[PDB]
Amino acid sequence: SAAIGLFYGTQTGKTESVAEIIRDEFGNDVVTLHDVSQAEVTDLNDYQYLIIGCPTWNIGELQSDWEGLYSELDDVDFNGKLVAYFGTGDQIGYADNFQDAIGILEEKISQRGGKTVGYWSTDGYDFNDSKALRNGKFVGLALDEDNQSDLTDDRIKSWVAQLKSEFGL
Numbered sequence: 706s707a708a709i710g711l712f713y714g715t716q717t718g719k720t721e722s723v724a725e726i727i728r729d730e731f732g733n734d735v736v737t738l739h740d741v742s743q744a745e746v747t748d749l750n751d752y753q754y755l756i757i758g759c760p761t762w763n764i765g766e767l768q769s770d771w772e773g774l775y776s777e778l779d780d781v782d783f784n785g786k787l788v789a790y791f792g793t794g795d796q797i798g799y800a801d802n803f804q805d806a807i808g809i810l811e812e813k814i815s816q817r818g819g820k821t822v823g824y825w826s827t828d829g830y831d832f833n834d835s836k837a838l839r840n841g842k843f844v845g846l847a848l849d850e851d852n853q854s855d856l857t858d859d860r861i862k863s864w865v866a867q868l869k870s871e872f873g874l
């Protein structure tokens with residue numbers, strides 16, 4: 706297996722596009738993409754480094770495929786894993802629930818032993834509240850393809866360099 710498993714869900718394809726750009730930055734032989742619409746929770750056993758990608762849907766909820774797999778996360782352990790998070794979301798239209806999904810996923814995975822890496826500054830976002838907040842930072846990379854698509858590539862580039870260092874790769 707590759708070093709990093711990137712498990713993403715997507716409804717309108719935006720988080721998947723972001724997943725592909727992250728894979729391109731790390732390299733094809735470093736990151737393997739797993740669409741959680743077809744993944745089994747035991748797939749997570751194949752990796753000591755994880756990237757969890759999830760947009761927030763209506764409203765403050767996990768993307769439907771990730772919602773489906775969320776209950777099964779208790780059937781697997783994350784001891785010794787390093788885990789990063791990214792999501793797409795809409796900070797203008799959903800300012801009270803911006804990036805809730807990655808907050809919800811990290812809460813669970815860290816409770817099951819996964820150590821979170823890749824915290825991200827809230828600088829440059831306009832929102833009211835988020836379940837991804839952790840001591841004034843986002844729990845992971847927050848992208849906004851609806852309102853800030855022109856910032857996405859630079860954000861990913863900066864985050865992956867940061868992440869590579871935190872993973873120790």
Ligand SMILES: Cc1cc2nc3c(=O)[nH]c(=O)nc-3n(C[C@H](O)[C@H](O)[C@H](O)COP(=O)(O)O)c2cc1C
Binds near residue numbers: 714716761793796803
């Ligand atoms: C009706 C609906 C509800 C949404 N709710 C939220 C939300 O609660 N929080 C958020 O950050 N974004 C919300 N969004 C924005 C989406 O998360 C955003 O468009 C994202 O890029 C979609 O990712 P995907 O294409 O991978 O499914 C919502 C979008 C729609 C249309």
Ligand SMILES: [Mg+2]
Binds near residue numbers: 747
């Ligand atoms: Mg397997």
Ligand SMILES: [Mg+2]
Binds near residue numbers: 776779
């Ligand atoms: Mg449970």
